[PDB]
Design a protein around this ligand. Structure first.
Ligand SMILES: Nc1nc2c(c(=O)[nH]1)N[C@H]1C(S)=C(S)[C@@H](COP(=O)(O)OP(=O)(O)OC[C@H]3O[C@@H](n4cnc5c(=O)[nH]c(N)nc54)[C@H](O)[C@@H]3O)O[C@H]1N2
Ligand SMILES: Nc1nc2c(c(=O)[nH]1)N[C@H]1C(S)=C(S)[C@@H](COP(=O)(O)OP(=O)(O)OC[C@H]3O[C@@H](n4cnc5c(=O)[nH]c(N)nc54)[C@H](O)[C@@H]3O)O[C@H]1N2
Ligand code: SF4
Ligand code: SF4
Ligand code: SF4
Ligand code: SF4
Ligand SMILES: [S]
Ligand SMILES: [W+6]
Lengths: 967, 214
């Protein structure tokens, strides 16, 4: 017997760090955790953990962690340990008061909005799926519109980028499936450091003949294990990708039958579409926007976009595609990327080889592509390349957008963003006066092969309103939830504008709930100051941090700060029950190992007790529009005067509120909805999230399944369909109808995802019901096609190269437009465009050993041991030019701030040859903050600009300009 | 006896093994600072039984050869560390005949620590400056005797770390070397007939670390 584990209880958990979703085993003293290591039975990690997962014991049994809630009275220099009862009652008062004062029944136009604009909320992908959904509905029942989290400043561009392209915003395949690839391109990702267990499956791909390619400004621990490494200048992705489009078309490396049948190659674009010198048609200079109606397809009499299946018509998408990317020749791409013409051709040849029907190429990307003013268009370009090579829907193919936090997929799914309810049903605008007008926005299709599954939205919105308000008719309950103004850009309600408004005193109360915006928000100085102008900041986190203690950071004085900061110390993942949705949409149940530390509790128990006291206060006192608060179905969340993850999960899935007949099947009242297929609009069904419909059925909790048993067909691509549950309805690989010909025969029989026979689909769950060749394969698309031409995006239906808002070149070689013509910027804010003061490319990125702002990992001695201080990675050429020695203290400065870092001088960074001139970069980690540890350093976000993508408002944290100088 | 096969052609220097060693044993963290490298702790010590060494070798064209060496006791088949310690006091260094683990006891405090270290071809032993006890990798001998993998082997996501019986691992080592040569033609096994920690190097073992091989 091993002494250490002899007297302890063994439970399963899921890692609280990255979205790989590795299994843990927690040994608990029969009652604190004595050991935490990997779960050898988990099909993703097989017992493996990176240093973050391997150190979860040091996090969970940490002596720097929050015991009992602290209260900071205004202008104070210190905390005071208060009780649960004080903390939740006083806060429930503060919410009620601030709401009552600023609650808007009708807007300036006279339209019903029923919202509070004085309260904002940030967070959090760190919370369980059950808690995330509860939190959003609580904030919305309180009338909040300014509801954001990690997703905004992470993969927010991925959602519209892939939804435009394929009809869903999620990672198309999953981790296990990478092993099936013939060519793995890792670009705008450092997967070996930031999704380490992913390289188990990347290396298994290579074992079976796959070529591994890393394209990155820096040579990384990923690059060390790849067959081909190529450098790329930060912000130069579209040139590279536009170059590969041209390359594929010229050399006829596209998958012809796939392109003709399954993409919108054949659709006829209207005559009003044009592009000249970096501007598409319909450009409005005065309002920094485009008239998208100029980009509309030519429609037949039935309203179905016209098609030329011979692909000969000059306004066919494929022919307009050839025309747009003809300017992206090897000489010009080389000149603007810094990537040699030889390496472009090497990478182009290797990846375009997967255009072959029985060969699969996949892309692994994350913040390298998203954190740009062209974030959406970066991703669009690669989605278009995958459609040309027929890599969407196939095993070892797809677009593997690597999600960040353990449950950022989940937290996005639960609509903790300003523009979406749970299940990607949009937040109503002021002109959606009724539920019928809301549903009327959903585009219809008169193509008999187009499934157009979003036509089912009325059933999901009605079942959602039933989940929240089960005694009200949906049409009635619709009036309770707040609405944004139709007149505004969406980006007015997003992160960067929420902090600009906070910096004008337009907010009273912020919830920094499982986020550290003092270090995690771009342009951190602005944020730290702006937060001074809150009347009450609430912070729910594991440790005291830079956010919860902003009032004393580099130059902060309680002499001039009046924020009633409340600090509510929460449980860690291993002390909590619930689910977390990983990058592949795998919804994984985890259990309580230890009891909670120092009388602290889960967010679900916090927020439910907190809101309950509001529900009680409004039952006693008066106050503005109290109907949304009183009527909330909250008893369905509970079992023993505490949050019931198990019951909240069953509500999300949903159950019949009465006896119903749906899809030629009889259902009894009270029993669970077996899939979103059986939801109704008439109030017969509730469902907190239609995506969760089928996750928790009568059969039990499918998220809790630990079954690695597969069929032969499933086993040769590693679907593991019996392990946990993935939305939608256990479709492990999205768009899998595209993996077969119109007879139902796999393109790659060796690696088949689905196969037709016995009049049914075998293997993965078919993504869209119907016999072979009777439906278009992208069921969530209006027209049913993979969109090469995507006219829904803010800056055009094709990706076009625009330099970062702070760039090292003065002239775009592709057009007369230097920057994104509709880019999100704030009026006044400065930009170093070839400024002599800031001549070097600035970028921020991660190391394996630290997590996010480092709030969690800067408290863990073993991770500080490995990476104790902020560093600054520079080439030998730049080190020479600035007289910097390896290990020297350097000062890195931008227009927005400056910091000190240890210089890592390395051959892993080299000059970028941009227009015959050598351009130098400065790399920084953003894992550090003033609070801990000693000499650790501050956030790199002191340097980062508060501008970026016009679609999603993601800040440009991967490409700006800086100076570096020796101290 | 037992054997590790360490395929460095698969190592991403994640340092999962470095943290996993300290977590299992509940070892303290060293005081460290960045001096222009990701390597930390910079060396093995009384409290650090495994550290991943980072070495950058210049290469013809873009990128480098980045060489990662998760260093540990080789648990030698005929350990010279025991030969030297036994000169001063038998029972300071002992051998498990079932597993093949070479184990330092607290009696090492009463032998010539400097001599025992110098006796190591791989420069593995480290002395506690206060108590003069010798510490290194103990092969997680307790886990192995209880039918578990060593903490650093179980944690490794890439397939770099492999563990099992001598015959099984030597066979795996020979088979893997043949496959790895197709990508890394200059690949070699480290002292495969002398040690129970058999490293596969992608090139000159000495480029990984000056004491990588004897
Ligand atoms: N170890 C670790 N793992 C993590 C996290 C962590 O903090 N630490 N956090 C998680 C989260 S929240 C997320 S979203 C993911 C993100 O994971 P990644 O996206 O891998 O994270 P980064 O290191 O920020 O960026 C990846 C790479 O982008 C490169 N890059 C920079 N600018 C550009 C550019 O303009 N173009 C291209 N093509 N590449 C560029 C950088 O050099 C870097 O190597 O990681 C997750 N996992
Ligand atoms: N310059 C630059 N800035 C960046 C990035 C970049 O690449 N470059 N990356 C961006 C990205 S992708 C992201 S995701 C954001 C992340 O930015 P933040 O979300 O602000 O980062 P952290 O707060 O460090 O990490 C999440 C928090 O979750 C908390 N937490 C853990 N478990 C729980 C729990 O059970 N409950 C609660 N309530 N909290 C919990 C942790 O303590 C931690 O503070 O930063 C962005 N910022
Ligand atoms: S951080 Fe990611 S890769 Fe590392 S153990 Fe956790 S889930 Fe796995
Ligand atoms: S855990 Fe494996 S891959 Fe990571 S550093 Fe150690 S040996 Fe290398
Ligand atoms: S590597 Fe050194 S310390 Fe370890 S068994 Fe061999 S001689 Fe002894
Ligand atoms: S075998 Fe055990 S003691 Fe040796 S390095 Fe690995 S985890 Fe540490
Ligand atoms: S994230
Ligand atoms: W993220």
């Amino acid at each position: 017997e091993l002494q250490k584990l002899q007297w302890a209880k063994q439970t399963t958990s899921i890692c609280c760090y990255c979205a790989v979703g590795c299994g843990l085993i927690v040994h608990t003293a029969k009652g604190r955790a004595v050991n935490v290591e990997g779960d050898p039975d988990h099909p993703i990690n097989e017992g493996s953990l990176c240093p973050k997962g391997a150190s979860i014991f040091q996090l969970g049994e940490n002596d720097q962690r929050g015991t009992q809630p602290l209260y900071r009275a205004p202008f104070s220099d210190t905390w005071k340990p208060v009780t649960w009862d004080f903390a939740l009652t006083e806060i429930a008062k503060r919410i009620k008061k601030t709401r009552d004062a600023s609650f808007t029944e009708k807007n300036a136009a006279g339209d019903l909005v029923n919202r509070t604009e004085a309260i904002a909320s940030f967070g959090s992908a760190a919370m369980d799926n059950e808690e995330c959904w509860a939190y959003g509905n609580i904030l919305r029942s309180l009338g909040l519109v300014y509801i954001e989290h990690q997703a905004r400043i992470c993969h927010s561009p991925t959602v519209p980028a892939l939804a435009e392209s394929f009809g869903r915003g999620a990672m198309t395949n999953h981790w296990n499936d990478l092993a099936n690839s013939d060519c793995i391109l890792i670009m705008g990702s450092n997967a070996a450091e930031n999704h380490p267990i992913a390289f188990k499956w990347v290396l298994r791909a290579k074992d079976k003949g796959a070529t591994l390619i890393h394209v990155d400004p820096r040579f990384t621990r990923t690059s060390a294990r790849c067959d081909v490494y190529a450098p790329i200048r930060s912000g130069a992705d579209i040139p590279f990708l536009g170059g590969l489009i041209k390359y594929i078309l010229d050399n006829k490396l596209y998958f012809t039958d796939y392109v003709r049948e399954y993409t919108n190659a054949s659709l006829i674009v209207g005559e009003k579409f044009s592009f000249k010198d970096g501007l598409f048609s319909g450009y409005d200079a005065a309002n920094k926007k485009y008239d998208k109606s100029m980009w509309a397809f030519e429609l037949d009499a039935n309203g179905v976009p016209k098609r030329d299946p011979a692909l000969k018509h000059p306004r066919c998408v494929i022919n307009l595609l050839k025309k747009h990317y003809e300017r992206y020749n090897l000489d010009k791409v080389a000149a603007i990327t810094g990537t040699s013409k030889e390496q472009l051709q090497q990478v182009y040849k290797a990846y375009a080889a997967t255009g072959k029907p029985d060969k699969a190429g996949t892309i692994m990307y994350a913040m390298g592509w998203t954190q740009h003013s062209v974030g959406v268009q970066n991703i669009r370009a690669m989605a278009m390349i995958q459609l040309l090579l027929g890599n969407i829907g196939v095993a070892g193919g797809g677009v593997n957008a690597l999600r960040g936090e353990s449950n950022v997929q989940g937290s996005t799914d639960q609509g903790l963003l300003a523009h979406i309810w749970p299940g990607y049903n949009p937040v109503p605008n002021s002109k959606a006066a009724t539920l019928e007008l809301y549903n009327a926005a959903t585009p219809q299709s008169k193509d008999p092969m187009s499934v157009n599954w979003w036509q089912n939205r009325p059933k999901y919105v009605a079942s959602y309103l039933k989940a929240l308000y089960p005694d009200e008719e949906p049409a009635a309950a619709y009036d309770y939830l707040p609405r944004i103004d139709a007149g505004r850009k969406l980006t007015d309600y997003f992160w960067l504008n929420i902090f600009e408004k906070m910096d004008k005193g337009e907010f009273k109360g912020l919830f920094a709930w499982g986020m550290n915006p003092a270090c995690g928000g771009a342009n951190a100085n602005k944020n730290r100051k702006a937060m001074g102008k809150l009347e009450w900041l609430v912070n729910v986190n594991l440790f005291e941090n830079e956010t919860s203690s902003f009032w004393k950071g580099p130059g902060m004085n309680p002499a001039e700060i009046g924020t009633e900061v409340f600090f509510l110390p929460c449980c860690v993942s291993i002390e909590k029950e619930g689910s977390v949705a990983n990058s592949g949409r795998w919804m994984q149940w985890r259990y309580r190992g230890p009891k909670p530390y120092a009388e602290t509790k889960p967010d679900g128990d916090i927020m439910l007790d907190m809101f309950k006291k509001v529900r009680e206060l409004y039952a006693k006192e008066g106050g503005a529009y109290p109907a949304p608060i009183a009527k909330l179905n909250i008893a369905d969340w509970e079992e023993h005067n505490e949050f019931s993850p198990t019951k909240v999960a069953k509500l999300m899935n949903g159950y019949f509120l009465k006896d119903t007949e749906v899809g030629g099947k009889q259902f009894k009242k009270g029993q669970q909805v077996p899939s979103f297929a059986f939801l109704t609009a008439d109030g017969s069904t509730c469902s907190g999230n239609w995506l969760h419909a089928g996750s928790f059925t009568d059969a039990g909790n499918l998220m809790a399944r630990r079954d690695k048993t597969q069929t032969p067909e499933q086993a040769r691509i590693g679907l593991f369909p019996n392990w946990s549950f993935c939305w939608p309805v256990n479709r492990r690989i999205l768009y899998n109808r595209a993996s077969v010909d119109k007879t139902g025969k796999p393109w790659n029989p060796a690696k088949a995802v689905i196969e037709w026979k016995d009049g049914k689909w075998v293997g993965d769950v078919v993504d869209g019901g119907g016999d072979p060749g009777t439906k278009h394969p992208f069921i969530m698309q209006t027209h049913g096609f993979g969109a090469l031409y995507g006219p829904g995006r803010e800056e055009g239906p094709f990706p076009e190269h625009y330099e970062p808002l702070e760039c090292p070149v003065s002239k775009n070689p592709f057009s007369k437009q230097l920057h994104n013509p509709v880019a999100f910027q704030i009026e006044g804010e400065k930009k170093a465009v070839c400024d002599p003061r800031y001549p070097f490319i600035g970028t921020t990125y991660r190391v394996t050993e630290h997590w996010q702002t480092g709030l969690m990992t800067r408290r863990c001695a073993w991770l500080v041991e490995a990476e104790p201080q902020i560093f600054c990675e520079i080439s030998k050429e730049l080190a020479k030019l600035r007289g910097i020695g390896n290990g020297d203290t350097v000062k890195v400065s931008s227009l927005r701030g400056a910091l000190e870092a240890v210089a890592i001088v390395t051959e892993r960074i080299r000059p970028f040859k941009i227009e015959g001139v050598d351009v130098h970069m400065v790399g920084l980690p953003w894992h550090y903050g003033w609070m801990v540890p000693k000499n650790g350093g501050d956030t790199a976000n002191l340097l980062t600009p508060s501008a970026g993508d016009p679609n999603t408002g993601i800040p440009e944290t991967k490409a700006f300009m800086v100076d570096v100088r020796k101290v | 006896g037992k054997m590790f096969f360490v395929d460095l052609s698969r190592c991403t220097a994640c340092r999962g093994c470095q943290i996993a060693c300290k977590q299992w044993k509940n070892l303290p963290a060293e005081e460290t600072r960045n001096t222009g490298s990701h390597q930390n702790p910079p060396d093995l010590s009384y409290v650090t039984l495994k550290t991943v060494r980072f070495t950058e070798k210049s290469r013809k064209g873009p990128g480098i050869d980045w060489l990662f060496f998760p260093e540990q006791c080789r648990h030698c088949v005929e350990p010279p560390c025991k030969g030297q310690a036994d000169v001063d006091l038998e029972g300071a260094v002992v051998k498990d005949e079932t597993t093949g683990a070479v184990l330092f006891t607290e009696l090492t405090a009463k032998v010539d620590g400097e001599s025992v270290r110098s006796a190591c071809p791989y420069d593995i032993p480290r002395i506690d400056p206060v108590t003069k006890r010798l510490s290194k990798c103990d092969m997680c001998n307790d886990r192995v005797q209880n039918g578990l993998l060593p903490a650093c082997v179980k944690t490794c996501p890439t397939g770099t770390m492999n563990f099992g019986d001598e015959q099984e691992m030597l066979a795996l080592a020979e088979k893997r070397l043949a496959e790895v040569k197709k990508t890394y033609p200059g690949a070699v096994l480290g002292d495969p007939n002398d040690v129970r920690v058999v490293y596969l190097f992608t090139r000159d073992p000495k480029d990984f670390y000056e004491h990588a091989v004897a």
